[PDB]
Amino acid sequence: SEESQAFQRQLTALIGYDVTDVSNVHDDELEFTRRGLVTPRMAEVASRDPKLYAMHPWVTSKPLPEYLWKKIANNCIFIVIHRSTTSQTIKVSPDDTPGAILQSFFTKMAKQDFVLRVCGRDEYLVGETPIKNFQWVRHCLKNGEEIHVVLDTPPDPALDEVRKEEWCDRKFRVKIRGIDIPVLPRNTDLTVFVEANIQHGQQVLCQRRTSPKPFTEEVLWNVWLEFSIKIKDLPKGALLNLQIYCRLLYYVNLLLIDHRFLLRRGEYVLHMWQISGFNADKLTSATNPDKENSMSISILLDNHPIARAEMPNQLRKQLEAIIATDPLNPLTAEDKELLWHFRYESLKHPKAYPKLFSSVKWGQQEIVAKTYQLLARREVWDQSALDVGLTMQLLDCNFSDENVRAIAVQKLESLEDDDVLHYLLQLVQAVKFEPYHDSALARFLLKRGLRNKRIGHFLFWFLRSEIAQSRHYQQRFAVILEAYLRGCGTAMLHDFTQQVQVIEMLQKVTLDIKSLSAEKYDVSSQVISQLKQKLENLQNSQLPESFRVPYDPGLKAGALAIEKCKVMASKKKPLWLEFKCADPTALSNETIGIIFKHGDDLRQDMLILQILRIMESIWETESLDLCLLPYGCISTGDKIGMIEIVKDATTIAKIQQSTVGNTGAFKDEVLNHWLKEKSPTEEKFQAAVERFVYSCAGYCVATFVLGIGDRHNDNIMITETGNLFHIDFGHERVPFVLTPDFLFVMGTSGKKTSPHFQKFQDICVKAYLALRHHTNLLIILFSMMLMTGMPQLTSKEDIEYIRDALTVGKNEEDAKKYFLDQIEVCRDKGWTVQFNWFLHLVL
């Protein structure tokens, strides 16, 4: 039971979806999946070390990069320690463990066991890890900052307490009975038919149509559709995709083999997803909850069970060629049969595996058999070093086979939380391509999230983001989330509970303000008053005392700095909110600044940001820093989210608006003055010039690769301290933005060269060819991003942008050349496409 039914309401209200609800299901898969997950939850709960769990030490086995060993000129590191305005600085060896450091500290003083917490954060320096390997440390040294730690006592694991739990040979065929809708769209007499496909990872196996019939609110064929495939030749995870044309208006899917390995039988009345008017919402096994407005379709099943000599030379080379080839290069029939015939050779090359397993006639019993024997002798794959790009490739929409997919997930098991975090978002999205609710991958996210509060925290927001936006996938995700929460342990349930109230509160406010200045560029006096009064109304009895900042879970925000909060001057009306630190042990009055925004789909931004982080760590692997500023951003519901404000930064545009602020002339010297005036010492200035040259360079390459490089001034920002960065990725060309104002900081004005600019192309090109060394990873992530993150998209040309840009199949010379030309376009065009935003105000 009873007090255990509150818990459920807690869960549902925490999730944003009621998973005990059974009104949008035609079977028990979700229920079954709720049951299936108890063990892997309990298992992981049971085996986690309570102390290290409560402190969630954020840590990495990566080597410390060159550019930070450079920053330590003494093989020794300073750490200020505090007890209560009593503090001493300690020389420490980069290889010193924390316990080891406590040894030397107790030694120092008086002439039990406490723990090193970071000043101002919910971050601890604990565990047999040399300090060189805690992230905070690496982050402090990056920025030229000191390292402030208070000594306090550990958090009681009691607070992580988890609740008690006490839980034939026949051809296949389908009777299309007919379809219904209540209200008919365009109205004038058109014509309509049903298309029934037998699908397996977007490979199509058979297809049947109906004769068409006049499009009216009710249409009844009552036909058998005898397909070409044999019942027994059906593979697990095969979808019966049902589609409607007149062209494509609606689609829906049914697993032909249920989660119990049972051929699917009987009557079904399926409510169908309308078209927007390829992508991952097409694949779903879910039905439209909206029974009242959706088109639907009746059908019937009743058809039970089921569960090397020497290769030539020039063929080996055709083979190696095929294998050695981007994920988007499609395979000829000729290729596929080659791969299949020489599968045992193909098997020694882990890079072949995606190509190889998509050369499988999955519509043949006998061949899948062989394909499993093939997976049996996995020596080489098991032993290969982890390649995430490769691994990821095998979790995309192209692979429905449960066992292919699961070897990829084997490979992830060896990732440390550091990397789990990098890829967490994409991996969560990759759930959408899983044929069944319960999957190896789902279970793996579950483990890793429960094992580590950082992953757990981000897992929560990532699943919740989707649950609240997508009906296609909310059911499945809601089940995974519920699984998580039942293991994360009441500490976090309270945290998530705080957090969820705050962002529901603050979105209420966000939307109410849009109502009050329609478009009208200016923001009425009236507006700001009301914003002020609401936030005051909120703070006085309703808002929590403090709360974790979802995009950065080490930060506890306290009260609002109402004075500093405002509505932004947008066509949308985002909030500029700022909070005090709730941590009194913090080093500053410097606020936490968060922007809330409705009107853009931030799921996209989230993705782009995550790819930015990935690029930054690729550059880590060649001892390269380009100071990208992939600020925090978390989507939270329908076209609405939050955004980390970056301290001390303005808009390239505004730096123009200041001096001239014209309707839109444009000047080249202005940026460089703006730096001087924000550099209290001329040598710090050269650091701004420094940071800028990198940041510019970073964003130049990145932005180009993603093809989001032609942007307006207003959507680029720089820090008072040189760090340039792009924003707002919800929104003649130019490849990327290299305006003449930038180049004047690089000591050039219209076609010359100079110390820092030589440096600029040097870094740029380094950066560029460095990402080409991870081509397949970027291609797979990008392609997935578009499939899980976008509007509709061409399953060739939208995606194919990024191979031409990564200049696939090219030696480093051509490529370097290519990139350099992409610079020279921005110097042909100078201010031209910048200038052009304005003009089309009327075109």
Ligand X SMILES: CCCn1cnc(CCNC(=O)Nc2nc3ccc(-c4cncc(OC)c4)cc3s2)c1
**Shortest distance (Å) from residue 551 CB to ligand X:** 11
Q: Which of 397, 488, 595, 705 binds ligand X (CB under 6 A)?
A: 595
Q: How far apart are CA 48 and CA 451, in angstroms?
A: 6
Q: Which of 328, 505, 618, 646 binds ligand X (CB under 6 A)?
A: 646
229 among annotated binding-site residues: no
Q: Which of 140, 649, 687, 793 binds ligand X (CB under 6 A)?
A: 649
131 among annotated binding-site residues: no
Question: Which amino acid is it at 572?
Answer: K
714 among annotated binding-site residues: no
725 among annotated binding-site residues: yes
> Residue 814 in contact with residue 427, Cβ under 8 Å?
no
Q: How far apart are CA 839 and CA 843, in angstroms?
A: 8
Count of alpha carbons within 13 angstroms of residue 196, beta-carbon side: 27
Tell how many helices (H) and how many strands (E) occur in the chain. Answer: 31, 28
596 among annotated binding-site residues: yes
Could you tell me which residues are beta bridge partners of residue 270?
Answer: 297
Nearer to ligand X, 649 or 689 (CB): 649
Nearer to ligand X, 338 or 652 (CB): 652
Task: List phi, psi (to 5°) of 240.
Answer: -85, 100
Q: How far apart are CA 780 and CA 785, in angstroms?
A: 8
3-state secondary structure 661-708: CCCCCCCCCHHHHHHHCCCCCHHHHHHHHHHHHHHHHHHHHHHHHHCC
Neighbours of 324 (CB within 10 A): 12
Q: How far apart are CA 194 and CA 223, in angstroms?
A: 11
Binding positions for ligand X, 564-593, rule CB under 6 A: 568, 574, 578, 591, 593
Helix pair angle (490-514, 525-539), 10° resolution: 160
**Shortest distance (Å) from residue 569 CB to ligand X:** 10
- Spatial neighbors of 533 by CB under 8 A, at least 6 apart, are none
DSSP annotation of 789 reads H
Rounded CA Rg of the chain: 29
Q: How far apart are CA 332 and CA 62, in angstroms?
A: 40
Q: Which stretch binds ligand X (CB under 6 A): 150-158, 413-421, 643-651, 736-744?
A: 643-651
65 among annotated binding-site residues: no
**Shortest distance (Å) from residue 72 CB to ligand X:** 30
597 among annotated binding-site residues: yes
Count the site residues for ligand X by CB under 6 A. Answer: 17
**Shortest distance (Å) from residue 461 CB to ligand X:** 17
Count of alpha carbons within 13 angstroms of residue 627, beta-carbon side: 22
**Shortest distance (Å) from residue 605 CB to ligand X:** 6
418 among annotated binding-site residues: no
635 among annotated binding-site residues: yes
**Shortest distance (Å) from residue 316 CB to ligand X:** 51
Angle at the Cα of 213 from the Cα atoms of 212 and 217, rounded to 5 degrees:
130
3-state secondary structure 375-406: HHCCHHHHHCCCCHHHHHHCCCCCCCCHHHHH
Binding positions for ligand X, 618-637, rule CB under 6 A: 631
Q: Which stretch binds ligand X (CB under 6 A): 347-355, 396-404, 501-509, 640-648?
A: 640-648
Nearer to ligand X, 25 or 645 (CB): 645
**Shortest distance (Å) from residue 635 CB to ligand X:** 12
**Shortest distance (Å) from residue 648 CB to ligand X:** 5
Binding positions for ligand X, 395-424, rule CB under 6 A: none
**654 binds ligand X per the rule CB under 6 A:** no
Q: Which of 275, 407, 645, 670 binds ligand X (CB under 6 A)?
A: 645
Binding positions for ligand X, 725-764, rule CB under 6 A: 727-728
Q: Which stretch binds ligand X (CB under 6 A): 118-126, 297-305, 438-446, 638-646?
A: 638-646
**Shortest distance (Å) from residue 633 CB to ligand X:** 7
Nearer to ligand X, 485 or 557 (CB): 557
Binding positions for ligand X, 244-303, rule CB under 6 A: none
**Shortest distance (Å) from residue 650 CB to ligand X:** 6
Count of alpha carbons within 13 angstroms of residue 656, beta-carbon side: 22
Nearer to ligand X, 571 or 752 (CB): 571
Count of alpha carbons within 13 angstroms of residue 807, beta-carbon side: 23
Question: Which amino acid is it at 122?
Answer: D
594 among annotated binding-site residues: yes
Alpha-carbon dihedral of residues 187, 191, 194, 200, nearest 10 degrees? -90
Q: How far apart are CA 545 and CA 494, in angstroms?
A: 13
Token pair 């085996």 in the structure block, residue: 47
Nearer to ligand X, 120 or 350 (CB): 120
Binding residues for ATP: 593-602, 628-636, 725-731
Q: Which residues bind ligand X (CB under 6 A)?
A: 568, 574, 578, 591, 593, 595, 597, 631, 643, 645-649, 717, 727-728
Binding-site residues, in ranges, read 593-602, 628-636, 725-731
